[PDB]
Write an enzyme that holds these catalytic residues in place. Structure first.
Site, PDB file in Angstrom:
ATOM      1  N   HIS A  13       0.809  -1.217   0.000  1.00 19.05           N
ATOM      2  CA  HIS A  13       0.000   0.000   0.000  1.00 19.05           C
ATOM      3  C   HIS A  13       0.852   1.281   0.000  1.00 19.05           C
ATOM      4  O   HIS A  13       0.276   2.362  -0.106  1.00 19.05           O
ATOM      5  CB  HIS A  13      -1.070   0.022   1.097  1.00 19.05           C
ATOM      6  CG  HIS A  13      -0.541   0.163   2.481  1.00 19.05           C
ATOM      7  ND1 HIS A  13      -0.455  -0.936   3.322  1.00 19.05           N
ATOM      8  CD2 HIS A  13      -0.209   1.275   3.180  1.00 19.05           C
ATOM      9  CE1 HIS A  13       0.001  -0.470   4.480  1.00 19.05           C
ATOM     10  NE2 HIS A  13       0.177   0.847   4.442  1.00 19.05           N
ATOM     11  N   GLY A  70       2.299   5.912  10.460  1.00 20.57           N
ATOM     12  CA  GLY A  70       3.728   5.910  10.185  1.00 20.57           C
ATOM     13  C   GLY A  70       4.385   4.584  10.544  1.00 20.57           C
ATOM     14  O   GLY A  70       5.525   4.327  10.159  1.00 20.57           O
ATOM     15  N   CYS A 129       3.379   1.469   9.725  1.00 22.14           N
ATOM     16  CA  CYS A 129       3.308   0.409   8.712  1.00 22.14           C
ATOM     17  C   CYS A 129       4.658  -0.021   8.247  1.00 22.14           C
ATOM     18  O   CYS A 129       5.557   0.820   8.082  1.00 22.14           O
ATOM     19  CB  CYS A 129       2.429   0.826   7.548  1.00 22.14           C
ATOM     20  SG  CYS A 129       0.696   0.847   7.963  1.00 22.14           S
TER      21      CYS A 129
HETATM   22  C1  XKQ Z   1       0.030   2.517   7.608  1.00 24.71           C
HETATM   23  O1  XKQ Z   1      -0.366   2.467   6.245  1.00 24.71           O
HETATM   24  C2  XKQ Z   1       1.099   3.581   7.815  1.00 24.71           C
HETATM   25  O2  XKQ Z   1       1.689   3.654   8.890  1.00 24.71           O
HETATM   26  N1  XKQ Z   1       1.324   4.410   6.798  1.00 24.71           N
HETATM   27  C3  XKQ Z   1       2.115   5.618   6.942  1.00 24.71           C
HETATM   28  C4  XKQ Z   1      -1.221   2.733   8.486  1.00 24.71           C
HETATM   29  C5  XKQ Z   1      -0.988   2.451   9.970  1.00 24.71           C
HETATM   30  C6  XKQ Z   1      -2.114   3.001  10.854  1.00 24.71           C
HETATM   31  C7  XKQ Z   1      -2.062   2.516  12.277  1.00 24.71           C
HETATM   32  C8  XKQ Z   1      -3.041   3.261  13.187  1.00 24.71           C
HETATM   33  F1  XKQ Z   1      -2.373   1.177  12.297  1.00 24.71           F
HETATM   34  F2  XKQ Z   1      -0.814   2.626  12.730  1.00 24.71           F
HETATM   35  N2  XKQ Z   1      -2.305   1.892   7.996  1.00 24.71           N
HETATM   36  C9  XKQ Z   1      -3.394   2.388   7.406  1.00 24.71           C
HETATM   37  O3  XKQ Z   1      -3.705   3.583   7.450  1.00 24.71           O
HETATM   38  C10 XKQ Z   1      -4.298   1.356   6.723  1.00 24.71           C
HETATM   39  C11 XKQ Z   1      -4.157   1.414   5.183  1.00 24.71           C
HETATM   40  C12 XKQ Z   1      -3.457   0.210   4.550  1.00 24.71           C
HETATM   41  C13 XKQ Z   1      -4.532  -0.843   4.431  1.00 24.71           C
HETATM   42  C14 XKQ Z   1      -5.889  -0.145   4.416  1.00 24.71           C
HETATM   43  C15 XKQ Z   1      -5.592   1.349   4.628  1.00 24.71           C
HETATM   44  C16 XKQ Z   1      -6.433   1.997   5.718  1.00 24.71           C
HETATM   45  N3  XKQ Z   1      -5.711   1.657   6.954  1.00 24.71           N
HETATM   46  C17 XKQ Z   1      -6.190   1.622   8.214  1.00 24.71           C
HETATM   47  O4  XKQ Z   1      -5.489   1.276   9.153  1.00 24.71           O
HETATM   48  C18 XKQ Z   1      -7.638   2.057   8.477  1.00 24.71           C
HETATM   49  N4  XKQ Z   1      -8.346   0.919   9.035  1.00 24.71           N
HETATM   50  C19 XKQ Z   1      -9.239   0.226   8.306  1.00 24.71           C
HETATM   51  O5  XKQ Z   1      -9.599   0.514   7.183  1.00 24.71           O
HETATM   52  O6  XKQ Z   1      -9.696  -0.816   9.000  1.00 24.71           O
HETATM   53  C20 XKQ Z   1     -10.708  -1.610   8.339  1.00 24.71           C
HETATM   54  C21 XKQ Z   1      -7.766   3.333   9.357  1.00 24.71           C
HETATM   55  C22 XKQ Z   1      -7.013   4.487   8.692  1.00 24.71           C
HETATM   56  C23 XKQ Z   1      -7.198   3.115  10.762  1.00 24.71           C
HETATM   57  C24 XKQ Z   1      -9.245   3.709   9.478  1.00 24.71           C
END
Ligand code: XKQ
Ligand code: XKQ
Lengths: 302, 302
Positions: free
Chosen positions: B41, B143, B145
């Site tokens: 992603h 951040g 991920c």
């Molecule tokens: C991650 O992509 C990252 O750190 N990027 C800079 C991030 C990590 C968030 C956390 C709170 F877990 F540390 N992950 C996301 O934002 C992911 C992303 C990749 C897969 C789907 C897309 C949305 N997402 C989420 O975590 C969302 N959760 C869901 O959609 O759950 C069903 C939220 C942004 C937390 C709503």
């Protein structure tokens, strides 16, 4: 989101752990620059431990009586001295993995990470607090002496604890990196007991802020309390006094959540008097006191 | 003595963390040999996240669209491919700090350490379990991920988790290092929820053995139970079934303490039915299930 008992990454400290042997006693040492720091009791035999005179025991030793091993290589000891309850062994090689470091003596209530080691090899990392009775609730087996506690501030390793002994209640006693014991303990195998411990109130409040930041708010209430009335209830439950300095340190958390410190104190008072009624806070059925306000801000703000 | 939630020393993994940027998305990557592994992603924009077609999104990218930073130096991307939900970026430099490593896909109930990272910099280490509902109760901010979970077996790092997302209940979902999600989750910002979780029974029993090894025996009783009668009570409390394989894995702990597994099951049954009556086990007022039998033997035997 989430809130865990989080230790500092241990890499910078792992690169400093060595094994120190003197006679049949083997324990851990901390190799920084060309010096290896370890508990001075490495020079003792089982008979000496009951009542040792460390000055005599050290005068009877030579550099060649100390075997320092850094992984698979031997570090020749070229000098030795005692500073309080630590032994400093000057070696022929400066540690190339020496991080930016400091030695600090912490106050009760401060937390730190422990890198448990055996034979100079790191085994695990966990988070502790210096208890108000100057013990730590660690996890240490025979061979772990010389394992250190530390905090990491940006890129600086602040060493604050070196492990020396276990008290009858299963809690642990040790020194700062300059060999001064925390608490009244001494490095001799004689009758010693930890005093009665108390709860680190400022840390319980910090953890209640962490719970709010993470969406756990069931324990909040419309009430406030005065610092005096809170401290009157706190003493009754063996909680440490909350000071105006503690209230100030909780300022940033109080502002981020919109809950005044004395408002959170009224929640803590209600929890102390009524209990949790089958509920949990951050996955705990007890009030946690081993997160400082800085630990909460660090973990919740990254 | 003592029993703590203990993580593996993180040094070997810290030496592998890098920052990966694609457009305005920055996250963490794992640099092993000449390959950087990260969540696929990283190629998405906010609009793409709702329903991405990763094959199209990747075909539209080039090596120069990926910025890999290992500390203060830039690692040139010379190749890229997608394996399930991970992106593999071949780089011009092999990581000189690459430890002996393996990628493993763990089973629910297994524990691991998480090295939380931000912008390629390690922030903290904590211990997790893969829950029976295939989520982890981690502590992750935006951040994080690309942060990984791992176990250390002697000198081998077994990577088992890479962080991708947070579910509405505040728990976390991610993949193995080959990009397969644990559980039914998908890497898209759409309605997803963790199923109801259960307690890891074999781990609760392992932790009750840890309590006995550490001198906490108040919960022990003269009774035994059958595996069937224990499982009938366990189901009622949302506990996972205890299998004969679990009973066998607890064999060494059972022999070291002299308490048969089915004898310990009768204690667990009594705790589930009566509660603790104001008492604690290893400093906990809840039954802990995030220590495996191996974690107990490792921590209690060093
Ligand atoms: C991650 O992509 C990252 O750190 N990027 C800079 C991030 C990590 C968030 C956390 C709170 F877990 F540390 N992950 C996301 O934002 C992911 C992303 C990749 C897969 C789907 C897309 C949305 N997402 C989420 O975590 C969302 N959760 C869901 O959609 O759950 C069903 C939220 C942004 C937390 C709503
Ligand atoms: C440590 O010296 C070591 O690891 N050496 C190989 C060892 C660590 C034990 C443990 C359980 F904490 F990991 N420490 C000791 O054995 C110390 C030793 C140095 C200072 C006094 C002398 C005895 N000692 C103890 O821990 C004893 N405790 C006390 O005397 O408490 C008052 C016991 C051996 C635990 C009884």
């Amino acid at each position: 989101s989430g809130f865990r008992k989080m230790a500092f990454p241990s890499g910078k400290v792992e690169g400093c752990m060595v094994q120190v042997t003197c006679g049949t006693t083997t324990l851990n040492g901390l190799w920084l620059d060309d010096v290896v720091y370890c508990p001075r009791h490495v020079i003792c035999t089982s008979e000496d431990m009951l009542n040792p005179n460390y000055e005599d025991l050290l005068i009877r030793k030579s550099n060649h009586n100390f075997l320092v091993q850094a992984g698979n290589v031997q570090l020749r000891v070229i000098g030795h001295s005692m500073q309080n309850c630590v032994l400093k062994l000057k070696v022929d090689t400066a540690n190339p993995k020496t991080p930016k470091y400091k030695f600090v003596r912490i106050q009760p209530g401060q937390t730190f990470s422990v890198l448990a080691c055996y034979n100079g090899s790191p085994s695990g990392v966990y988070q502790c607090a210096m208890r108000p009775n100057f013990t730590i609730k660690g996890s240490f087996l025979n061979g772990s002496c010389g394992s250190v506690g530390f905090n990491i501030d940006y890129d600086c390793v602040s060493f604050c604890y070196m492990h020396h002994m276990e008290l009858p209640t299963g809690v642990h006693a040790g020194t700062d990196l300059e060999g001064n014991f925390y608490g009244p303990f001494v490095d001799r195998q004689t009758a010693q007991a930890a005093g009665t411990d108390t709860t680190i109130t400022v840390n319980v409040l910090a953890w209640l802020y962490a719970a709010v930041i993470n969406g756990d708010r069931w324990f909040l209430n419309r009430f406030t309390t005065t610092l005096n009335d809170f401290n009157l209830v706190a003493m009754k439950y063996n909680y440490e006094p909350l000071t105006q300095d503690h209230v100030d340190i909780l300022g940033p958390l109080s502002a981020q959540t919109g809950i005044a410190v004395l408002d959170m104190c009224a929640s803590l008072k209600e929890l102390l008097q009524n209990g949790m009624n089958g509920r949990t806070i951050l996955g705990s059925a007890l009030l946690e006191d081993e997160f400082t306000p800085f630990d909460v801000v660090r973990q919740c703000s990254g």
